[PDB]
Amino acid sequence: VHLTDAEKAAVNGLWGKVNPDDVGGEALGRLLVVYPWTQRYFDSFGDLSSASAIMGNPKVKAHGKKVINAFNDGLKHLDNLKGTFAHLSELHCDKLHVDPENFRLLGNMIVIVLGHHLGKEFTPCAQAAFQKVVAGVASALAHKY
């Protein structure tokens, strides 16, 4: 991860004005709708039968908060993405058996909820800064396979 100074202030500044709780529940929300094989991994969240069922579902929102707080960690400790995510990488490998391709997929869901959310402030410059982080956060969760 590079993350230059003007590339650093774009991230923490634009992250400034998103509600993290909704970014998380909505990204997790969208992922399951756009990629329905991801529902199998979350068999424990009740039914997920339609676009509605998987959006009012309190358990999806709840999980997507635990997701966003870890992502918030990412930002705090960009020195060591791998250290921060050592435990969680182990979890998603030894006990969940999630193919790493699924990480960049969710990464992308955060990427476009941010754009959906922030409007014409999610400039190509802003996006790129976020790309490198979500990319960094993705291979962080993969280094234990």
């Binding site: 929300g29 969208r30 709708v33 756009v34 676009a51 959006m55 992308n108 990427v111 476009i112 754009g115 959906h116 409007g119 014409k120 999610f122 190509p124 410059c125 996006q127 790129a128 790309q131």
Partner: protein, 139 residues
Amino acid sequence: VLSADDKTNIKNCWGKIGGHGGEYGEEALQRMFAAFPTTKTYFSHIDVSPGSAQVKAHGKKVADALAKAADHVEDLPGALSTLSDLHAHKLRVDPVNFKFLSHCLLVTLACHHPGDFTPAMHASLDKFLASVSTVLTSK
């Protein structure tokens, strides 16, 4: 696959982009060249700096093939076979690259249409650009 719901979701969307398709396709490219600079390699022959005139021309051309496809939703190999020999045969574009441009196209639409860019819509749209990506790499 594309249901009747997918077919009609698409047409509303391209009904709404109207004549912005051109400047959208520009933005999507500009977004790809920065978030995924690996792609810049395929365009060594043109100026590519953020705001630009050759990026603008290619931009419009892209969104036209998107307009075309949306029209011939049911005959995508048919409608876009001339762009198949260009990418698959002539240029040898990596099949991973189409996932980067399709994504940046979604970030573009999502940015410009918060009201319309719902989950239900967004899946059809992804799915759509996946078969547009598929046919594009079909050879």
